[PDB]
Amino acid sequence: NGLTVLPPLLTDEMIAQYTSALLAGTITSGWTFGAGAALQIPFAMQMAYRFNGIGVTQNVLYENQKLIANQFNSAIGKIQDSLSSTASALGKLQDVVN
Amino acid sequence: NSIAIPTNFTISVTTEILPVSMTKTSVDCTMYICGDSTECSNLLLQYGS
Amino acid sequence: QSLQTYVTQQLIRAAEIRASANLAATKMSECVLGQSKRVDFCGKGYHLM
Amino acid sequence: NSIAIPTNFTISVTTEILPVSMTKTSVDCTMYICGDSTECSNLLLQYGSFCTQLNRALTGIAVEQDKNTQEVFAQVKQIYKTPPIKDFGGFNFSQILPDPSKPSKRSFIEDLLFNKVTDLICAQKFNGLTVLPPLLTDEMIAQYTSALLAGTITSGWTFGAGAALQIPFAMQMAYRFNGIGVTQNVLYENQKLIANQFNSAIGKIQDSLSSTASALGKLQDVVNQNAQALNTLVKQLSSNFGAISSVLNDILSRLDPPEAEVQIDRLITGRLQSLQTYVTQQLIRAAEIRASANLAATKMSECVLGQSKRVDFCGKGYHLMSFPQSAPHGVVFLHVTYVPAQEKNFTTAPAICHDGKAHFPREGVFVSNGTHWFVTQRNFYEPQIITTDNTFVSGNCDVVIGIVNNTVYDPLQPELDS
Amino acid sequence: YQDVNCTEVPDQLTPTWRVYSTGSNVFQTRAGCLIGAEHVNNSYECDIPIGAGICASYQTSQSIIAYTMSLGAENSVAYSN
Ligand SMILES: *[C@@H]1O[C@H](CO)[C@@H](O)[C@H](O)[C@H]1NC(C)=O
Ligand SMILES: *[C@@H]1O[C@H](CO)[C@@H](O)[C@H](O)[C@H]1NC(C)=O
Ligand SMILES: *[C@@H]1O[C@H](CO)[C@@H](O)[C@H](O)[C@H]1NC(C)=O
């Protein structure tokens, strides 16, 4: 009946090549790769420059580093198990298609 | 004169889903209004743009 | 008339998607390419990254 | 343990064009559906009150079009005039402040926009299609965006938050560096270079707008769209909608009322549908313009009436300041931004251990040239000596990973010795 | 009368409207010919917006006045170095 659905300009394999270059700059450069030439900086030493932006001083981080790592990792794991659950929170995305 | 100072923190990861685009559709007006009928194409032609 | 109604619905829904794809761009530009100080914008709590 | 500290900066001017309003149209429903035909006016009268709905909608649109320009520009409660001075620490503002030579108050960049953005219109007039003039003329807009530009220069972030307070221009740019991390001594010792970079950036912008493939294609897209939809509304008077003919006088002079009416009605139902479609398109496009004229107001309220800390909002780079300029049915922003350059690898360390206790930086990072250790601010290489002044002791140097054995010099003990 | 040069305001259809088709209050703007208003040399933040920078309002023993809308007061910050 003449109803056509065209394919997008950006394939689903090119999107993954942006959102993996937006995620290897944050890890290794920080807030700098989006404001000029990216400048590397050790990851720990940038998280402590993000604590120092919300009030807590750096000695809080450098003396609780292991606990912070072992909390962030657990949070990531729980997120992965959360998305895989039913009644998915991605109901916003499948509402558009419906 | 009573304050409450936190003593231990908790790093939490949330999630947020946002729509960005939707399927790019396109309909062929003549082929739908009356398709494969040359006897109707002329009639539709005069009906406007 | 049915085709016109469908086109109008698509126009309005595309306006909604346009509105919700300029908030995702903002959240990507601020919550990701930096650090936010806007309360309860990049998730509940003080935003780290 | 490898950091990269910029050593030389670059002040860059961007541009951003935003639509603000669109032409205020108005159609006379009766004069268009069947004009100059009293034999059809009575027939249309009984057809309902569509004729007034499709005039109230186009009135609401033409009202919010007048409101958008009030919202975007009318943010100053007074009209500042820049004093006749040039002592702007070497900064040159000729290309943006209004000139005395030209009869109007149009600045040297606002005119490059007017001479870049560009019968049938009479036929639209004969068919009841009117285009009203805006409430704010194009000579009053220039009297706001030249009072929004002589307050930023001479008052700063204060004229939009109470009574304007003057402050030397140099001494305010240094209070905008001090908002993005770089200390003031960076500015006051690089003042000439900063002036001679900002001026060059302005010149290159002026040459950039004058180029072809103009970036102002956003502003001339609005006009093209609103002049293309209205041309179809006139093209569609040539379609007969299945009636005998498309000229109403033909039908009136070939058929008696009993049979004339049953044809006029398939005309009156053909033109009214077209008019409703046009009104709906105008409503939706006006919603888009309303959305894009409340982002221009925000950018004017934040990027201009202050300084922004929202990344990649007021132009790429760290945002220093901005300047508004008018444009036909639109606003132009010149974001002046600070961009680092010429990185240089260094070896770093989290915390330094002097007497077993771990010293930490107060503002900056630790940087070594391979033999000596200094502490430097993070957006410019300005090494200092690691003293007990700019490092705050915390805890014992056994818990932090990456601590470096070194020496910290106290200012008290050596000078006290005598 | 929107976008009508003032000469064309006639013909003499009804005199109650011919009163508003002539007189000494006939005024010309960039939006057309406005009749029934007094053109003053003041300036105000305007109440009823005619268009093209002209606005009308009711005031003094009173009548309708059509003036040029005022943007605001003057100021000149004493900028020294
Ligand atoms: C950095 O990595 C190197 C890799 O060999 C290792 O020897 C060194 O101890 C590490 N230092 C820190 C502070 O992580
Ligand atoms: C209006 O009419 C006057 C009187 O004839 C004439 O001098 C003037 O040029 C006309 N202007 C316009 C815009 O029609
Ligand atoms: C108003 O200004 C006009 C323009 O010069 C002038 O001709 C007229 O005499 C003025 N009237 C009054 C009352 O000031």
Residue numbers in the entry:
A (entry chain D): 856 to 953
B (entry chain D): 710 to 758
C (entry chain D): 1002 to 1050
D (entry chain B): 710 to 827, 848 to 1147
E (entry chain A): 612 to 621, 627 to 676, 689 to 709
What does the paper say about this structure?
The receptor binding domains (RBDs) of the S trimer adapt “up” and “down” two distinct conformations, of which only the “up” RBDs bind the human host receptor protein hACE2 (10–12).
The final refined structure of spike-ATRA was a symmetric homotrimer, of which the receptor ACE2 binding region was partially buried at the contact interface with a neighboring “down” RBD and not fully accessible. These densities could only be observed in the closed spike-ATRA C3 map but not in the closed spike-DMSO C3 map, which was also determined to a resolution of 3.51 Å in this study. ATRA could be well fitted to this elongated density, with its cyclohexane head in the pocket and its carboxyl group at the distal tail exposed. The cyclohexane head of ATRA in the hydrophobic pocket was surrounded by the side chains of a series of phenylalanines and tyrosines, including Phe338, Phe342, Phe374, Phe377, Phe392, and Phe515 and Tyr365 and Tyr369.
